[PDB]
Design an enzyme around this catalytic site. Structure first.
Site, PDB file in Angstrom:
ATOM      1  CG  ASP A  42       2.804   0.657   4.548  1.00 44.24           C
ATOM      2  OD1 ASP A  42       3.595  -0.249   4.892  1.00 44.24           O
ATOM      3  OD2 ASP A  42       3.081   1.476   3.647  1.00 44.24           O
ATOM      4  CD  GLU A  43       6.404   3.575   3.080  1.00 45.23           C
ATOM      5  OE1 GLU A  43       6.842   2.501   2.612  1.00 45.23           O
ATOM      6  OE2 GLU A  43       6.771   4.699   2.675  1.00 45.23           O
ATOM      7  CG  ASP A  56       7.295   1.029   6.025  1.00 45.80           C
ATOM      8  OD1 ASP A  56       6.437   0.121   5.969  1.00 45.80           O
ATOM      9  OD2 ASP A  56       8.026   1.322   5.056  1.00 45.80           O
TER      10      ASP A  56
HETATM   11  C1  LIG Z   1       6.214  -2.734  -2.685  1.00 47.19           C
HETATM   12  C2  LIG Z   1       4.742  -3.021  -2.920  1.00 47.19           C
HETATM   13  C3  LIG Z   1       3.814  -2.918  -1.881  1.00 47.19           C
HETATM   14  N1  LIG Z   1       2.505  -3.186  -2.117  1.00 47.19           N
HETATM   15  C4  LIG Z   1       1.568  -3.059  -0.999  1.00 47.19           C
HETATM   16  C5  LIG Z   1       1.632  -4.223  -0.103  1.00 47.19           C
HETATM   17  C6  LIG Z   1       2.427  -3.751   1.027  1.00 47.19           C
HETATM   18  O1  LIG Z   1       2.036  -4.429   2.193  1.00 47.19           O
HETATM   19  C7  LIG Z   1       2.082  -2.362   1.125  1.00 47.19           C
HETATM   20  C8  LIG Z   1       3.217  -1.596   1.757  1.00 47.19           C
HETATM   21  O2  LIG Z   1       4.425  -1.520   1.042  1.00 47.19           O
HETATM   22  P1  LIG Z   1       5.817  -1.898   1.663  1.00 47.19           P
HETATM   23  O3  LIG Z   1       6.037  -1.210   3.042  1.00 47.19           O
HETATM   24  O4  LIG Z   1       6.821  -1.402   0.681  1.00 47.19           O
HETATM   25  N2  LIG Z   1       5.987  -3.577   1.800  1.00 47.19           N
HETATM   26  P2  LIG Z   1       5.436  -4.230   3.196  1.00 47.19           P
HETATM   27  O5  LIG Z   1       4.910  -3.164   4.105  1.00 47.19           O
HETATM   28  O6  LIG Z   1       4.316  -5.240   2.855  1.00 47.19           O
HETATM   29  O7  LIG Z   1       6.610  -5.053   3.905  1.00 47.19           O
HETATM   30  P3  LIG Z   1       7.729  -4.344   4.796  1.00 47.19           P
HETATM   31  O8  LIG Z   1       7.422  -2.858   4.930  1.00 47.19           O
HETATM   32  O9  LIG Z   1       9.076  -4.543   4.142  1.00 47.19           O
HETATM   33  O10 LIG Z   1       7.748  -4.985   6.150  1.00 47.19           O
HETATM   34  O11 LIG Z   1       1.800  -1.900  -0.187  1.00 47.19           O
HETATM   35  C9  LIG Z   1       2.104  -3.551  -3.338  1.00 47.19           C
HETATM   36  O12 LIG Z   1       0.932  -3.793  -3.556  1.00 47.19           O
HETATM   37  N3  LIG Z   1       2.964  -3.662  -4.359  1.00 47.19           N
HETATM   38  C10 LIG Z   1       4.271  -3.406  -4.173  1.00 47.19           C
HETATM   39  O13 LIG Z   1       5.164  -3.527  -5.247  1.00 47.19           O
HETATM   40 MG   LIG Z   2       5.138   1.243   3.079  1.00 48.72          MG
HETATM   41 MG   LIG Z   3       5.628  -1.406   5.045  1.00 47.07          MG
END
Ligand SMILES: Cc1cn([C@H]2C[C@H](O)[C@@H](COP(=O)(O)NP(=O)(O)OP(=O)(O)O)O2)c(=O)[nH]c1=O
Ligand SMILES: [Mg+2]
Ligand SMILES: [Mg+2]
Length: 342
Positions: free
Chosen positions: A104-105, A9
DNA sequence: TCTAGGGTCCTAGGACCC
DNA sequence: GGGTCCTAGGACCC
């Protein structure tokens, strides 16, 4: 019979990409989301922003009230997609058992890998490395005997860290594990379970499977199983997109059919363009439309249809507008396509 | 503060079959 | 009456 599952992730994904490509955004609070004036919400935020309470899915208004100096970015999705393709290529070096869950996952089943002496911990740490090399982005990872625990684990030690859950650690890890941390359990379910005194997997263990099944069904069985640490979902690798949608929320509610129609005229070419990329002949199974009213009630009207067709989408939209609007203002118009079966 | 846009999976009634 | 399709809607994730 016990597997080796990795969940990878990326950290602050969109924001991370935007900071790499513009280091001037590195130590200031930034967020990807629409403007307040356009009724936007935060897609995501960097750590300087999160310090202020800015979170994904937060309306942009609240985000700005919390963080007045927030630098707001529109998003650059081809760049994020580039990063995604790249990291999936990296995943392909260690295994072919890869299930992408989003840009991203990803899940990786490395149970039968010869890389890194079969050490899932080393495979993971080595995947986090070379992602930081090659891309200059950081990833986090979880290592567990099953999917959902690997997913929970990847979140445990971010940013730029990993967390390992061995079978031996599983019972202790679960006893305290709040049900809301389980993927698939959101606020509604968690609240409904917490009503009946169920906060953790420990509580579901001591619970009756038949009441759980009669009350929640298939989901109830799943809750029981994951509470026992049981999760036999295999890593797929052969999953296909099933639908394509394009919707827009307008800055102001609309009250006239002409406005809806104008929106659709702008929406269709985007849907056609995106559908054409995987389906040049535009052949489909179903198509339909979506309207969301000022009471936030949403309705969709979809039907069997063999090929993407603007006029039918407009007529369907007009029937929906005339039959279901009930004098309400309309905040969102959307178009949708269901892809063919195979 | 004021609530996106990209999607998946599950439920539920009626149609349809047998 | 079960299995499966159709359509509409909700919960959840990213
Ligand atoms: C949760 C979420 C993510 N996204 C996008 C932006 C995030 O960068 C991307 C990945 O989701 P995420 O892994 O849940 N959040 P993150 O990767 O930005 O932060 P982190 O994984 O907690 O470090 O998807 C949205 O556009 N709306 C959302 O409600
Ligand atoms: Mg993610
Ligand atoms: Mg992420």
């Amino acid at each position: 019979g016990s597997r080796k599952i990795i969940h990878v992730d990326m950290d602050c994904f969109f924001a991370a990409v935007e900071m790499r490509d513009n280091p001037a955004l590195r130590d200031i609070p930034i967020a990807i989301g629409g403007s307040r004036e356009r009724r936007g919400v935060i897609s995501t935020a960097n750590y300087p922003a999160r310090k202020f309470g800015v979170r994904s899915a937060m309306p942009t208004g609240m985000a700005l009230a919390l963080c007045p100096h927030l630098t707001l970015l529109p998003g650059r999705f081809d760049a994020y997609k580039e990063a995604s393709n790249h990291i999936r290529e990296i995943f392909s070096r260690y295994t072919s058992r890869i299930e992408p869950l989003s840009l991203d996952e990803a899940y990786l089943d490395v149970t039968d890998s010869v890389h890194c002496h079969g050490s899932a911990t080393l495979i993971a740490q080595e995947i986090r490395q070379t992602i930081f090399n090659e891309l200059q982005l950081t990833a986090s990872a979880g290592v567990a005997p099953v999917k959902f625990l690997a997913k929970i684990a990847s979140d445990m030690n971010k940013p730029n860290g990993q967390f390992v859950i061995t079978p031996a650690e599983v019972p202790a890890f679960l006893q305290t594990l709040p049900l809301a941390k389980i993927p698939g359990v959101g606020k509604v379910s968690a609240a409904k379970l917490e009503a009946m005194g169920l906060r953790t997997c420990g509580d579901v263990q001591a619970c009756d499977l038949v009441m759980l099944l009669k009350r929640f069904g298939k989901f109830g069985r799943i809750l029981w199983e994951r509470s026992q640490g049981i999760d036999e979902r295999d890593v797929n690798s052969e999953r296909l997109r099933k639908s394509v949608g394009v919707e827009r929320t307008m800055a102001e509610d609309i009250h006239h059919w002409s406005e809806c129609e104008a929106i659709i005229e702008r929406l269709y070419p985007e849907l056609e363009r995106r559908l054409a990329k995987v389906k040049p002949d535009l052949l489909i199974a179903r198509q339909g439309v979506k309207l969301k009213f000022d009471d936030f009630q949403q309705t969709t009207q979809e039907h069997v249809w063999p090929r993407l067709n603007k006029a039918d989408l407009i007529a369907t939209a007009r029937k929906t507008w005339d039959e279901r609007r009930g004098g309400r203002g309309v905040r969102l118009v959307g178009l949708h396509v269901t892809l063919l079966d195979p």
